[PDB]
Enzyme design. Structure first.
Site, PDB file in Angstrom:
ATOM      1  CD  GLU B 357      -2.737  -0.994  -0.003  1.00 32.46           C
ATOM      2  OE1 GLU B 357      -3.280   0.117  -0.599  1.00 32.46           O
ATOM      3  OE2 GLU B 357      -3.358  -2.211  -0.474  1.00 32.46           O
ATOM      4  CG  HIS B 487     -13.260  -8.747 -11.729  1.00 39.42           C
ATOM      5  ND1 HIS B 487     -13.506  -9.586 -11.001  1.00 39.42           N
ATOM      6  CD2 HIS B 487     -12.376  -7.825 -11.167  1.00 39.42           C
ATOM      7  CE1 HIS B 487     -12.780  -9.349  -9.875  1.00 39.42           C
ATOM      8  NE2 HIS B 487     -11.935  -8.286  -9.968  1.00 39.42           N
TER       9      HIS B 487
HETATM   10 ZN   LIG Z   1      -2.397  -2.179  -4.412  1.00 37.89          ZN
END
Ligand SMILES: [Zn+2]
Ligand SMILES: *[C@@H]1O[C@H](CO)[C@@H](O[C@@H]2O[C@H](CO)[C@@H](O)[C@H](O)[C@H]2NC(C)=O)[C@H](O)[C@H]1NC(C)=O
Ligand SMILES: *[C@@H]1O[C@H](CO[C@H]2O[C@@H](C)[C@@H](O)[C@@H](O)[C@@H]2O)[C@@H](O)[C@H](O)[C@H]1NC(C)=O
Ligand SMILES: *[C@@H]1O[C@H](CO)[C@@H](O)[C@H](O)[C@H]1NC(C)=O
Ligand SMILES: *[C@@H]1O[C@H](CO)[C@@H](O)[C@H](O)[C@H]1NC(C)=O
Ligand SMILES: *[C@@H]1O[C@H](CO)[C@@H](O)[C@H](O)[C@H]1NC(C)=O
Ligand SMILES: *[C@@H]1O[C@H](CO)[C@@H](O)[C@H](O)[C@H]1NC(C)=O
EC number: 3.4.17.23
Lengths: 195, 596
Positions: B357, B487
């Site tokens: 992250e 998706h």
């Molecule tokens: Zn990521």
């Protein structure tokens, strides 16, 4: 023993928007320049020509104190021969500037949750600013070639935009208070000595 | 007074107004995510609605400056990025239906429930029940239930909707002067007006395919090794030359083969490297975790986190009354504000995630000086590739030993080396055929190459041939199983997972070369290597200002996608797989089916 009123400039409650920068003429007093540079309160204190190193020794006809607020990334434009929005459209120092530039972070004061939109700047102008010029016009900028008739629209923009200052912004997007001291030396009594 | 200069000025006004309006949305949407309240659900929406309505107002004005007359390429990019008609190119009545269908499909998947036979009361959603069965259970007949029932009660509802979704999406793309909706999606890789660095929308299909062909030998062996090991676990049910039954692959949709590790572990007795116990033993908290991540980036020449990061990120669950969306996310609010929302625990999987992250944060900081419309990864796959290569380095034994979490008396033997690379192969390699085949089915559906009465017939033909996967139960054209995945029924382009995967090993190999790593790419650490950091940074700052080919070339020195780095990463597993399948069939036969 009449001290110079630097308190009114630096500790003023609200500062000016950079396009309408505020000028305070100082005269007939004693200024202790070594108190400011040796107070360690300012993030920026660069002097051009004169030396902040106890050159309070010298006398000057008039000392001017220009004060405004800009963002942290824009303080570099308060310097001789620097370009940008501020230096071209709001506050232009000359190339042979003899004086100092002071600035400090004002996030505590001029930043409000949700945004303090009271500080502004000039985003558009037909030409650059001459040194120490002041333009406070609100005439609609014509970017195209059809008269705007005083109302914004297509290619017609209101020339002043509002600094949105928030406490969570980055340092470069945070507000900074700036004080520029101009030392004038004319054929005159030289009333500001401040030994 | 040129039309370009006007647009420069136009764009100049846009940027300054846009940053503030985006901030108000980001900050408010950050409140709901950190502090769920019906109050902030409404505050989040009010800021987003004003930002959605500002961009629609600015998109309209931008089209008044026709791109043909703009010559500065960086002006044309921003102008073009704001001139996207989108669904607006459609009639309101139609654009209002397409949004109804999309929302209807999103509602059916996310609320789709399956109930027990002979007990209508007992019911299971995809999460947590059905996903558990598929990903952890070991009963052919039980799994067939969860796999089949999901596609029969959720897929069939989506089938008529997906047909109308294909009609309207193709109308919107053709009106927007694209061939079909698939060509529209391929536009994210298009590049024009840059000699030597252009890229055609169609060239993606080529380079996707031409690079998948080079994966087939590595996938074929991984497939015959997994099939060999599954055959030991359900002997009466699996063919030693056939495709793999879909329900037996660890996911409901058979995407990642990760959960099959328990069955496919090369050397079961030797355990995996888990420094979680070592972290708790040294009393590490969430702030120590992110501190070590900061130190990693700084060790390669990248800046440390802004103070606003440490003051405004949520790195520990507040818990108690203050609920919060705990999915690890990296925020780029603008105006210098960078935050990470992460309900961090003291585990190894959240230690790596903290690097991953923070990798996004570094990419967000590096191109922040670019214009507002140019602050994004080079293409749709660049950003997630940067994030991945961080937990590649951070998880190696060489790195864990250097920060005092892995004992100096642990040494890599060739057996633990294979166990890890398999887990990685089951996740990284396993998904690539699934991903290429799923997007190829859609590309063709949109193209018109597959008629409505053969959607499912052509879906499972390609699952057999490309992925080596066979359905356990015959499926009519009432089914719409490609839409049983999020998706597809939530209208997300899927090729990014393919492209981003090839990207991250190209990245990793180029950077580890600068670190002068000696040995397999499997155990490289770019730590204490400013030369690697500078090469990566030369691409990070570009954002979208430069074409993604010239962006890639800044790191790796090649203008296009290549799978060789991925293969090099797995070569020691490739030759070990080529010494485990000597007396096993490498390949699959299309015809074998468990459904007679
Ligand atoms: Zn990521
Ligand atoms: C396209 O226009 C941009 C306008 O910003 C040009 O970039 C600027 O170039 C001047 C040249 O003196 C620099 O002072 C500015 O700092 C630049 N600004 C930015 C945002 O980079 C750019 O060079 C032009 N390119 C072409 C090929 O026309
Ligand atoms: C600005 O105020 C600073 C604070 O010190 C005292 O100053 C008094 C005038 C009053 O404001 C008190 O409340 C403060 O505690 C002072 O130290 C600085 O020197 C002042 N600025 C200048 C230019 O002198
Ligand atoms: C969360 O939202 C509620 C309602 O707006 C507010 O009263 C509370 O102060 C917020 N909590 C935080 C993060 O301070
Ligand atoms: C669609 O996009 C093209 C190219 O930007 C533009 O010329 C056209 O006016 C747009 N149509 C609408 C109605 O948005
Ligand atoms: C980040 O580095 C700067 C100097 O480059 C320093 O001023 C700042 O305190 C550092 N922050 C931390 C947490 O080390
Ligand atoms: C990087 O160098 C420092 C100082 O020489 C050393 O203490 C540190 O352990 C090195 N980093 C790694 C990853 O070992």
């Amino acid at each position: 023993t009449n001290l110079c009123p630097f308190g009114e400039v630096f500790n003023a409650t609200r500062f000016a928007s950079v396009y309408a920068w505020n000028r305070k003429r100082i005269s007939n007093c004693v200024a202790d320049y070594s108190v400011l540079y040796n107070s360690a309160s300012f993030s920026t204190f660069k002097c051009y020509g004169v030396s902040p190193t106890k050159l309070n020794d010298l006398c000057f006809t008039n000392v001017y104190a220009d004060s405004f607020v800009i963002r942290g990334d824009e303080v570099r434009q308060i310097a001789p021969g620097q370009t940008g929005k501020i230096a071209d459209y709001n506050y232009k120092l000359p190339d042979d500037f003899t004086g100092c530039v002071i600035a400090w972070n004002s996030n505590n004061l001029d930043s409000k949750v949700g945004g303090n939109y009271n500080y502004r700047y000039r985003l558009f102008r037909k030409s650059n600013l001459k040194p120490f010029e002041r333009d406070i016009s609100t005439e609609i900028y014509q970017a195209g070639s059809k008269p705007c008739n005083g109302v914004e629209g297509f290619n017609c923009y209101f020339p002043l935009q509002s600094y949105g200052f928030q406490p969570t912004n980055g340092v470069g997007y945070q507000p900074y208070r700036v004080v520029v001291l101009s030392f004038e030396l004319l054929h005159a009594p030289a009333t500001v000595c401040g030994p | 007074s040129t039309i370009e200069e006007q647009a420069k000025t136009f764009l100049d006004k846009f940027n300054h107004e846009a940053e503030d309006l985006f901030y108000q949305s980001s900050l408010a949407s950050w409140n709901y995510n950190t502090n769920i309240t019906e109050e902030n659900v409404q505050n989040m929406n009010n800021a987003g609605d004003k930002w959605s309505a500002f961009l629609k107002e600015q998109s309209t004005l931008a089209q008044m400056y026709p791109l043909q007359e703009i010559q500065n390429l960086t002006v044309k990019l921003q102008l073009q990025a704001l001139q996207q008609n989108g669904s607006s190119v459609l009639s309101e009545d139609k654009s209002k239906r397409l949004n109804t269908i999309l929302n209807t499909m999103s509602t059916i998947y996310s609320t789709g429930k399956v109930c027990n036979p002979d007990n209508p009361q007992e019911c299971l959603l995809l999460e947590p029940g059905l996903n558990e069965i598929m990903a952890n259970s070991l009963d052919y007949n039980e799994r067939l239930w969860a796999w089949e029932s999901w596609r029969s009660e959720v897929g069939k509802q989506l089938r008529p909707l997906y047909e109308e979704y294909v009609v309207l999406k193709n109308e919107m793309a053709r009106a927007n002067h694209y061939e079909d909706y698939g060509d529209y999606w391929r536009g994210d890789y298009e590049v024009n007006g840059v000699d030597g660095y252009d890229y055609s929308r169609g060239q993606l299909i080529e380079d996707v395919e031409h690079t998948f062909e080079e994966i087939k030998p590595l996938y074929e062996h991984l497939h015959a090794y997994v099939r060999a090991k599954l055959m030991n676990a359900y002997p009466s049910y699996i063919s030693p030359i056939g495709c793999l039954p879909a329900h037996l692959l660890g996911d409901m949709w058979g995407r990642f083969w990760t959960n099959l590790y328990s069955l496919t572990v090369p050397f079961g007795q030797k355990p995996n490297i888990d420094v979680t116990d070592a972290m708790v033993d040294q009393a590490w908290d969430a702030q120590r975790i992110f501190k070590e991540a900061e130190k990693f980036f700084v060790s390669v020449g990248l800046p440390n986190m802004t103070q606003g990061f440490w003051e405004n990120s949520m790195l520990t669950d507040p818990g108690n009354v203050q609920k919060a969306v705990c999915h690890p996310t990296a925020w780029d609010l603008g105006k210098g504000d960078f935050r990470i929302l992460m309900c961090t625990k003291v585990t190894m999987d959240d230690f790596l995630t903290a690097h991953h992250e923070m990798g996004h944060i570094q990419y967000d900081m590096a191109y922040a000086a670019q214009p507002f419309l140019l602050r994004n990864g080079a293409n749709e796959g660049f950003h997630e590739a940067v994030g991945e290569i961080m937990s590649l380095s951070a998880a190696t034994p060489k790195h864990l030993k250097s920060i005092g979490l892995l004992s100096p008396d642990f040494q890599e033997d060739n057996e633990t080396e294979i166990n890890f690379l398999l887990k990685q192969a089951l996740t990284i390699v396993g998904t690539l055929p699934f991903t290429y085949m799923l997007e190829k089915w859609r590309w063709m559906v949109f193209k018109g190459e597959i008629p409505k009465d053969q959607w499912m017939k052509k879906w499972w033909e390609m699952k057999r041939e490309i992925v080596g996967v066979v359905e356990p139960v015959p499926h009519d054209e009432t089914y719409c199983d490609p839409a049983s995945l999020f998706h597809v029924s939530n209208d997300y382009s899927f090729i990014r997972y393919y492209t981003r995967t090839l990207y991250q090993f190209q990245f990793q190999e180029a950077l580890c070369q600068a670190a002068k790593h000696e040995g397999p790419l499997h155990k490289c650490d770019i730590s204490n290597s400013t030369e690697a950091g500078q090469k990566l940074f030369n691409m990070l700052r570009l954002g979208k200002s430069e074409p993604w080919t010239l962006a890639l070339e800044n790191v790796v020195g090649a203008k296009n996608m290549n799978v060789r780095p991925l293969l090099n990463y797995f070569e020691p597993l490739f030759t070990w797989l080529k010494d485990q399948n000597k007396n096993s069939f490498v390949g699959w036969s299309t015809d074998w089916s468990p459904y007679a």
